[PDB]
């Protein structure tokens, strides 16, 4: 159980190398051996959390089997159960349930005095709220996490990750310079840490801020630095870079370089399945084809509504609308102009 707590400490530090060593060492201790049911639940909860960590930081695919698929009294194990399920629902874009599961965990957190645990909770709530572009709420939470992380040693990876949430929140607030500063500070931290995969990850996310600031060459240059890392290209997040490439290339009209990145998307999808980004890439590349283009865009937009990826609907509906406007297809331009409003209003409702 102390081993379990040490393992969770390593997860709370985003030390995937320690985390995987704890996971390998605790597995024999849990081979039909350990008897205490709350410890068995703790081990079952930490196994899920560890897989979410490996996905978050190493870009390793999440297992199809979750202990949360079918499991829904220590006041700690209950906080952990609600927090780790909020993360599972948050990743599935089931934000209604996630918000409820978070609020229950927040209530229990009143009885947990560990400062790192509190910073850990706030940083997960801030991440979900940022996914909804609830920027001020996310900042108030993450600002508490950063205060704690800066004053305690061993949480430099957590400070860096937190700064990326701040930067995106700033970008969602139109504060692109402050958003860049946050990502740059995160980049310095990761180079000090000598974590080149993390550095690639931060460059990819920074490219979102540059793109939102219409700093397209900086956006493309940041993506180039990310994709230079081999681990990044082998990760599930490679497709995110390829998609941002195509979209920024299309935005600036450098269509002659788009088939290059598009062909790499096919190689990604040959080995890894990602239906959200398949739809998103199909929408971007299909804009190069008129009526066929619109029918493909309607299918992709419809799938993104279905899986509740409203931020992508908002993003791509603006791009389709601009495309149709430029080609004199005003009825279709308005139709996707309206999808962008609908996606945004639905995102803010809850």
């Amino acid at each position: 159980a102390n081993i379990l707590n040490d393992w969770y400490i390593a997860i709370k530090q985003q030390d995937a190398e320690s985390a995987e060593r704890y996971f390998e060492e605790v597995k024999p201790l849990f081979d039909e051996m350990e008897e205490d049911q709350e410890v068995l639940m703790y081990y079952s909860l930490l196994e899920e959390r560890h897989k979410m960590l490996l996905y978050q930081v190493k870009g390793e695919e999440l297992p199809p089997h979750s202990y949360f698929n079918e499991n829904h009294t220590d006041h700690m194990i209950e906080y952990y159960f609600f927090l780790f399920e909020a993360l599972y629902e948050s990743h599935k874009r089931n934000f209604e349930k996630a918000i409820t599961l978070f609020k229950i965990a927040e209530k229990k957190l009143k009885d947990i005095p560990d400062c790192i645990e509190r910073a850990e909770f706030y940083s997960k709530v801030a991440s979900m709220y940022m996914m909804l572009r609830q920027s001020l709420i996310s900042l108030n939470y993450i600002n508490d996490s950063i205060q704690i992380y800066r004053e305690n040693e061993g949480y430099k990876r957590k400070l860096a990750t937190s700064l990326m949430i701040v930067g995106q929140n700033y970008t969602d607030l139109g504060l692109y310079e402050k958003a860049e500063e946050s990502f740059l500070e995160a980049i310095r931290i990761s180079r000090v840490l000598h974590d080149s995969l993390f550095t690639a990850l931060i460059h990819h996310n920074l490219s979102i801020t540059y793109s939102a600031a219409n700093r397209s060459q900086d956006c493309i240059n940041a993506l180039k630095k990310a994709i230079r890392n081999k681990e990044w290209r082998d990760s599930v997040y490679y497709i995110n870079s390829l998609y941002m490439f195509l979209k920024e290339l299309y935005k600036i009209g450098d269509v002659n370089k788009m088939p290059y990145y598009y062909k790499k998307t096919k190689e990604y999808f040959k080995r890894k399945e990602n239906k959200v980004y398949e739809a998103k890439i199909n929408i971007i590349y299909g804009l190069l084809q008129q009526r066929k283009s619109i029918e493909t865009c309607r299918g992709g937009i419809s799938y993104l509504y279905e899986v509740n990826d409203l931020d992508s609907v908002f993003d791509l509906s603006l791009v389709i609308s601009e495309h149709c406007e430029k080609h004199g297809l005003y009825k279709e331009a308005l139709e996707f102009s309206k999808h962008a409003i609908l996606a945004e209003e639905k995102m803010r409702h809850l």
């Binding site: 978050q56 940022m130 995106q168 990850l201 996310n205 979102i208 995110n240």
Partner: peptide, 6 residues
């Protein structure tokens, strides 16, 4: 676009 790794 939403950021990754958070």
């Amino acid at each position: 676009e939403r950021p990754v790794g958070t």
